[PDB]
Design a binder for this molecule. Structure first.
Ligand code: AMQ
Ligand code: AMQ
Lengths: 258, 258
């Protein structure tokens, strides 16, 4: 049976090919995760269908309804068999779904419009002029909401009450906000995305400071899935073979426009 | 049931405390992994006994004899219940034992005596004047043996046949060799150790170039062990709580000497 792969439209992980309107199925997409999915499928010997997550979210549990959304929800409720995307491995997610060992390492970082007088999370927490926020329904927002660390707690206290909302629905929306805010908005997103955008026209944004944490992305499967073991080994193999490093260079720097 | 923890004497992960000769049990040791064992045990609710791996090795499968040695062997043959040490998550190991998500991220790096005219792996491969090797029975040696990447394969071809042997039994042995070879020997070891040593007297070593790969250390358990799940969630919890970062800052920086 064809394996249903849930993923998210997030450059450069999954993107629409130039002539996608003339293409069908998996041929409509290109990107790091499109390439990765092919490698994993070949190694695990299965056929698959890439499907873009319906609500366009990574995945969080509704504190009220206790219902999971995004890619996590699609796995939890049986809509998809596996998730291949820049989905972060976290405690609350590991409680409901399985994750392979990481295929990419990263951490939350700060994106600023070049020239913005900010160099750290501490800087952001101390000032009021420059607003800052994160993407909704993901591990980054949960990071600040749950942090007991002084700096991050202060930032969360501010973000949770900010008006207008400093939270964005997608990475693209956040990038646009940084670029159009004349330096009055800083965006908290993972290092992977930050460094990617840093290499794309108009080259007006940049990553400042070190990462706030260290974590990774994992391929996810519903709890008890029979695909789990083989996928985990496939990831480890592809990494040791240097394929993952090649894919990173391919989509991040070989095509860099800055 | 007292959980038997197999680990290895490797500074600053596990070290004999001053006057350990008059100490007993777990109290004889100190270090990053000693602290981690305590937190993991507390979260998983178990008592444990730290034991230093008999052959002082990380773990590899002997060709021909096909028997696993080091900490991996301890787990595989039932000598230990869990391994808490700087043990790299690898494909071949994952085939015989289980690993938690990583508690530390790192990569293979190059250590040189300060002043050595080498800045990359390519440099080492492009010459023969400066010898170079890795530690025996571990992920680093296996990395070169299996790599199909031009530079690394060329390096392996040289190392496999070099005389006298460029392979060392322990990192301390590799470090001492770099320090006493007047720049005629470079050492291939993980970034964690390289960075640690660079801040220690006689402050005569340094890391050059970026890491060759990206991987992590995981807490290992016998395949199918009941401890697997709880340990994995414990590692994720501790990382998200910021404890893993505090622990590294404590054993690498707070104590740093150069
Ligand atoms: C990608 C990405 O970049 N910044 C982020 O917060 C994310 C989403 C994050 N990886 C998640 O799984 O929620
Ligand atoms: C620690 C350490 O530092 N360099 C290395 O090769 C190692 C050993 C490596 N972590 C293993 O598991 O074999």
């Amino acid at each position: 049976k064809t394996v249903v792969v849930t993923t998210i439209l997030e450059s450069p992980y999954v993107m629409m090919k130039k002539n996608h309107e003339m293409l069908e199925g998996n041929e409509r997409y290109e990107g790091y995760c499109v390439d990765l999915a092919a490698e994993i499928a070949k190694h695990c010997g299965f056929k698959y269908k890439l499907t873009i997550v319906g609500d366009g979210k990574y995945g969080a549990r509704d504190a009220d309804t206790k219902i999971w959304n995004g890619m996590v929800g699609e796995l939890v409720y049986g809509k998809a068999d596996i998730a291949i995307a820049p989905l972060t491995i976290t405690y609350v997610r590991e409680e409901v779904i399985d994750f392979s060992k990481p295929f990419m390492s990263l951490g939350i970082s700060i994106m600023i419009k070049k020239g913005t007088p900010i160099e750290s999370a501490e800087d952001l927490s101390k000032q009021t002029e420059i607003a800052y926020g994160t993407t909704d329904s993901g591990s980054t927002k949960e990071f600040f909401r749950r942090s007991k660390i002084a700096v991050f707690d202060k930032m969360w206290t501010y973000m949770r009450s900010a008006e207008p909302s400093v939270f964005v629905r997608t990475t693209a929306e956040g990038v646009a906000r940084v670029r159009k805010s004349k330096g009055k908005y800083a965006y908290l997103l993972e290092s992977t995305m930050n460094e990617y955008i840093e290499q794309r026209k108009p080259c007006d944004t940049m990553k400042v400071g070190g990462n706030l944490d260290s974590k990774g992305y994992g391929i996810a499967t519903p709890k008890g899935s029979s695909l789990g073991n083989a996928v985990n080994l496939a990831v480890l193999k592809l990494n040791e073979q240097g394929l993952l490093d090649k894919l990173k260079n391919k989509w991040w720097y070989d095509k860099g426009e800055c």
